Design a protein around this ligand. Structure first.
Ligand SMILES: CC(C)CCC[C@@H](C)[C@H]1CC[C@H]2[C@@H]3CC=C4C[C@@H](O)CC[C@]4(C)[C@H]3CC[C@]12C
Ligand SMILES: CC(C)CCC[C@@H](C)[C@H]1CC[C@H]2[C@@H]3CC=C4C[C@@H](O)CC[C@]4(C)[C@H]3CC[C@]12C
Ligand SMILES: CC(C)CCC[C@@H](C)[C@H]1CC[C@H]2[C@@H]3CC=C4C[C@@H](O)CC[C@]4(C)[C@H]3CC[C@]12C
Ligand SMILES: CC(C)CCC[C@@H](C)[C@H]1CC[C@H]2[C@@H]3CC=C4C[C@@H](O)CC[C@]4(C)[C@H]3CC[C@]12C
Ligand SMILES: CC(C)CCC[C@@H](C)[C@H]1CC[C@H]2[C@@H]3CC=C4C[C@@H](O)CC[C@]4(C)[C@H]3CC[C@]12C
Ligand SMILES: [Mg+2]
Ligand SMILES: [Mg+2]
Lengths: 680, 145, 48, 48
């Protein structure tokens, strides 16, 4: 470089960089980058034959060079890349469910890998490729060189994240743009890659762990740049978090992060500030949970509530207070609480010989909830996303149970049997309703993380259920046969094997009842019996409760203790994710409570029929200007550079790095000392 | 007057901390207790007018069943099931679901919620255990003052 | 006395009423941390 | 007041002395000193 031989550097830099990528030497890839290594000027070693596909021919040379890497890595034994491509079940162009010579010779093309990674992130992530920017006619334009680098880097970035090479991935991440979003995408690909379907095996275990580790590192990156943003300009950082991105289908960054299950990104102050500001709306954050409830019950004493944000002020203040998501959450809680209390009263009180008034009110209420569930199904990202939530499963089961019970009662209201069967179904309804009421505990910092812990301990019970059945069924069959021999098998035998054995694990001993059933006539419980075999029941039981109450229950307590320590350490992260889910759910919620949401439903349906259809006049369009977009990109790159400089400075102050630096420096000091003594 | 002692003093502070842990437990249990109680009371005694006895019935057994005391003989007597096997020869088929609801309930209450509270207690003890000396010295000043 | 007063201001400042929000959490923690440092000072001089 | 100021000064001198005997501070001091040692070594070789 100093001696004017830059042309020779530029002539050999592409193949040398290519060789460095093939032989897994990241330090050499950085070294070359800056000395004019143009990532888009790569050339393949061999020449590809024509395949009569217009998409495959339109590709650039740098495009066949990312494939050759996949082929070289894939031909090695037990490579996860070949298994992933084979288990993807797609054709050469990446189209789903379409899997010859073309399918095997060009099985690792960049378009197909792009489709696999696109399907790997989410159902709506598309990276738009535009290879035309690599033509000589697009050269007089100023900023293209950046675009060509960024796109090229992105493709190499995806390749380096796949083979789990963090250092080369981080480097290519640095070369391109959209750093925060790319780090989240990288985290998502590594987490999904870590389980998938091909890597499930026991021997790949350490390997998948590595992936997870890499995953952690990339979100750490995603948090870090963001942090700089939060310490450079908070409002502009908030604008970045509210910004619609092109790769995902106009999803903001927090929604992308939630879809990528990045708990670290969601727990960050900037992200929490955006979610909290959206949560409280135009209400001062310092407003009591009590104050908003009282204001809900007393709307004309709400004028002195908190600093916010004649007719066009009082009306504006009412529309801002009742448009806030916090108020909607409080209204839904109270409303669901009345539903629980009123439905509980309805089930406890006797049914009349005709459909009563309270039954009609509950019928209107559950139709309204059914319409609200239908509204949630239409206005969402997908059916899978809706059905993923446990609360949606509980609300569908409660609506289904109520309608089965009502129709059971309503088929023949003047029937004693119909009332009894209907109340039996409505018992299940009240249990699921009170369980569904736990959704509103999630706002609290104590009550929220505990539900997540409860679903985790439900998983621990299932393991306990599998271990106990052995003892319960074995002891039950043995004990039931010893207590009542020479008796034909019936349903009572089946009820007898299961009833006592299960209830004896909770400390309730049926020894008086087992003494009565054994026909042992004596002051001492098992001596003067008709059969000598029944005297072994107290022994079997003696083994059984030692197995059940002392060993299995306490083993489950130990599993519970581990489960608590596990969800205890990330209780804050899980609460912050629930904070977003509350914020996201109540933004679209109509304000009116559940019985009265029919007026809101008919109002939205009337508005929907009127606007964005025939005879319409209302339409909204809010698109960000190009100037503010270029401001966010330059700001994001500057904060990316600031983080990495700060990160390097912080990493040089570590004990390991300082000891390493001190050791190498002393070795170099003795080299200089050897030179001195020679001079002397 | 236990506060002078180096063993007995820090334990009162720990007790007020575990009283705070109970309140959290009370909020979590009501869901199971009220739900199972309304469901079970309706299944045991159907077609009966609401009264104060209904309210006493929803709260009494469900709460005392979380301490290991099972009212199965009493629930068998109330279900009007006439048989050597406890729930077979009953007048109504709906009352045979009481042992099942209960089966879910005590799994939720005695095995999951009580042990979760024990885990909260263990954290609370480690928390007031490390600063037991500091809290005892503050109580020492409060006695002195 | 100033170190004790500093500790009191940081502990009261750490909760107060304005900093209650979820996003200020790391921030209030910092305050508590600072609080600890100042009483450490208050103890230390006293020790001498 | 004079006694308290004197003990404040004694604590801070003792605190600084204690903080210089920490592993992190000694490693940092050793690293900067070796860097300065090579600067002095560069000056020597030039003189030679
Ligand atoms: C998903 C969960 C919560 C719902 C479970 C389904 C419940 C509501 C259904 C499934 C099977 C049903 C039972 C099937 C048959 C009978 C016999 C009849 O003489 C009395 C009612 C009774 C005993 C039904 C009560 C309600 C019942 C238990
Ligand atoms: C390994 C463990 C968890 C086994 C699970 C225990 C379950 C399946 C057992 C334990 C107690 C059982 C109940 C005991 C008594 C009765 C009354 C009878 O008229 C109908 C069946 C019914 C309601 C049983 C249903 C099944 C039951 C709930
Ligand atoms: C290896 C393990 C299972 C230990 C084995 C111990 C078993 C076989 C022992 C322990 C208690 C024993 C019982 C104790 C007392 C009596 C009364 C006697 O008039 C007939 C035998 C009978 C009913 C015994 C049968 C064998 C018995 C069940
Ligand atoms: C230290 C502990 C574990 C002692 C072990 C307890 C064992 C040995 C005891 C506890 C309860 C006992 C049983 C109680 C009652 C009877 C009924 C009698 O007609 C035969 C013996 C038999 C079946 C006993 C066998 C021994 C027994 C199982
Ligand atoms: C998803 C969860 C709730 C599991 C569902 C299991 C429920 C629905 C099952 C388990 C035990 C069952 C009961 C067991 C036995 C009988 C006796 C029969 O003559 C009428 C039905 C009845 C009363 C059953 C009703 C349905 C029942 C309560
Ligand atoms: Mg960049
Ligand atoms: Mg829902």
């Amino acid at each position: 470089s100093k001696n004017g031989q830059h042309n020779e550097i530029a002539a050999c830099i592409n193949d040398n960089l290519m060789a460095a990528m093939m032989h897994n030497k990241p330090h050499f890839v950085e070294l070359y980058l800056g000395f004019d290594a143009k990532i888009y000027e790569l050339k393949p070693s061999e020449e590809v034959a024509k395949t009569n596909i217009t998409a495959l021919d339109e590709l650039p040379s740098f495009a066949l060079a990312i494939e050759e890497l996949y082929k070289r890595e894939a031909k090695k034994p037990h490579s996860h890349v070949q298994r992933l491509v084979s288990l993807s079940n797609t054709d050469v162009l990446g189209r789903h469910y379409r899997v010859r010579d073309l399918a095997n010779t060009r099985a690792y093309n960049v378009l197909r890998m792009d489709q696999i990674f696109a399907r790997l992130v989410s159902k709506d992530f598309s990276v738009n490729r535009d290879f035309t920017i690599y033509d000589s006619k697009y050269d007089k334009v100023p900023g293209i060189q950046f675009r060509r680098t960024a796109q090229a880097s992105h493709m190499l970035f995806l390749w380096a994240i796949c083979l789990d090479r963090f250092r080369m991935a981080r480097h290519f991440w640095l070369i391109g743009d959209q750093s925060i979003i790319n780090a989240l995408v990288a985290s998502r690909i590594l987490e999904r890659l870590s389980t998938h379907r091909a890597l499930q095996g026991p021997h790949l275990a350490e390997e998948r762990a590595k992936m997870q580790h890499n995953a952690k590192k990339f979100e750490e990156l995603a948090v870090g740049v963001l942090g700089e943003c939060h310490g450079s300009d908070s409002h502009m950082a908030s604008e970045m978090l509210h910004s619609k991105n092109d790769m995902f289908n106009k999803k903001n960054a927090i929604n992308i992060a939630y879809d990528a299950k990045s708990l670290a990104f969601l727990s960050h102050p900037a992200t929490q500030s955006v979610i909290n500001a959206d949560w409280y709306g135009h209400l001062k954050s310092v407003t009591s949970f009590w104050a908003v409830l009282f204001a809900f019950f007393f709307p004309f004493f709400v004028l002195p509530f908190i600093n916010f944000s004649g007719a066009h002020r009082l009306r504006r203040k009412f529309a801002k207070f009742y448009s806030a998501p916090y108020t909607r959450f409080i209204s839904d809680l109270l409303s669901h609480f009345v539903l629980c209390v009123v439905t509980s009263y309805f089930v406890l009180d006797k049914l009349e010989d005709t459909i009563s008034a309270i039954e009609w009110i509950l019928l209107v209420w559950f139709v309204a909830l059914l319409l609200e569930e239908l509204r949630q199904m239409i206005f969402c990202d997908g059916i899978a996303e809706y059905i993923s939530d446990t609360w949606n499963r509980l609300d569908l089961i409660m609506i289904t149970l109520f309608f089965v019970g009502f129709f059971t009662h309503a088929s023949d209201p003047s029937n004693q049997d119909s009332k009894v069967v209907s109340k039996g179904i409505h018992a299940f309804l009240v249990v699921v309703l009170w369980l569904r009421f736990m959704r509103y505990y999630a706002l609290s910092k104590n009550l929220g993380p505990k539900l997540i812990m409860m679903m985790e301990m439900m998983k621990d019970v299932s393991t306990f259920v599998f271990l106990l059945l052995i003892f319960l069924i074995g002891y039950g069959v043995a004990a039931q046969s010893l207590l009542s021999p020479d008796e034909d098998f019936s349903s009572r035998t089946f009820i007898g094997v299961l009833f006592r054995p299960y209830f004896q694990i909770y400390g309730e001993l049926f020894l008086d009842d087992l003494n009565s059933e054994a026909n042992c006539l004596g002051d001492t419980p098992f001596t003067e019996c008709s059969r000598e075999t029944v005297r072994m029941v107290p022994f079997f039981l003696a083994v059984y409760i030692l197995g059940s109450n002392v060993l299995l229950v306490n083993l489950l307590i130990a599993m519970f203790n581990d489960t608590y320590m596990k969800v205890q350490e990330a209780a804050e992260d899980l609460w912050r994710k629930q904070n977003y889910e509350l914020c996201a759910e109540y933004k679209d919620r109509p304000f009116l409570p559940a019985p009265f949401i029919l007026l809101a439903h008919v109002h939205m349906l009337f508005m929907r029929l009127l606007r964005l259809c025939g005879v319409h006049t209302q339409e909204h369009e809010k698109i960000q200007d190009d100037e503010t977009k270029r401001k966010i990109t330059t700001f994001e790159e500057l904060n990316t550079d600031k983080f990495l400089r700060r990160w390097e400075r912080e990493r040089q102050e570590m004990l390991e790095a300082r000891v390493k630096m001190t050791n190498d420096n002393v070795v170099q000091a003795m080299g200089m000392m050897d030179q001195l003594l020679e001079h002397m």
